[PDB]
Design brief:
110 residues, mainly alpha, Recoverin, domain 1, two-stranded antiparallel ribbon, 8 helices, 2 strands, 4% strand, binds calcium ion, allergen
């Protein structure tokens, strides 16, 4: 659902949601950089990591990664098998199958 709408501008993330609408065209970097998440404070990020976390499993398993579009909405599709892979290695620096916060704030911090 529109959670980030609180943190960021629902209208802002919107364009960030339509920017990925394109299959195999999802550019997380562009996304975070769009809403501004990229460069933001590592504090808020942790708060942005919840928006996504729908099961508060503590982490964002590879299965949750593809659910990086269900954070800004409760319906948005899920990154492809590759898209999720890119967004994985793009963040996960250990390639274990999950992306923690320290890692989630990394893909954005860098
Ligand atoms: Ca989670
Ligand atoms: Ca990890």
């Amino acid at each position: 659902s529109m959670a980030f709408a609180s943190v960021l501008k629902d209208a802002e993330v919107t364009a960030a949601l339509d920017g990925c609408k394109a299959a195999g065209s999802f550019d997380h970097k562009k996304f975070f950089k769009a809403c501004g998440l990229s460069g933001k404070s590592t504090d808020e990020v942790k708060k942005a990591f919840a928006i996504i976390d729908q099961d508060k499993s503590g982490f964002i398993e590879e299965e949750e990664l593809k659910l990086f579009l269900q954070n800004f909405k409760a319906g948005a599709r899920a990154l492809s098998d590759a898209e999720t892979k890119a967004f994985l290695k793009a963040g996960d620096s250990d390639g274990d199958g999950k992306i923690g916060i320290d890692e989630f704030a990394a893909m954005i911090k860098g």
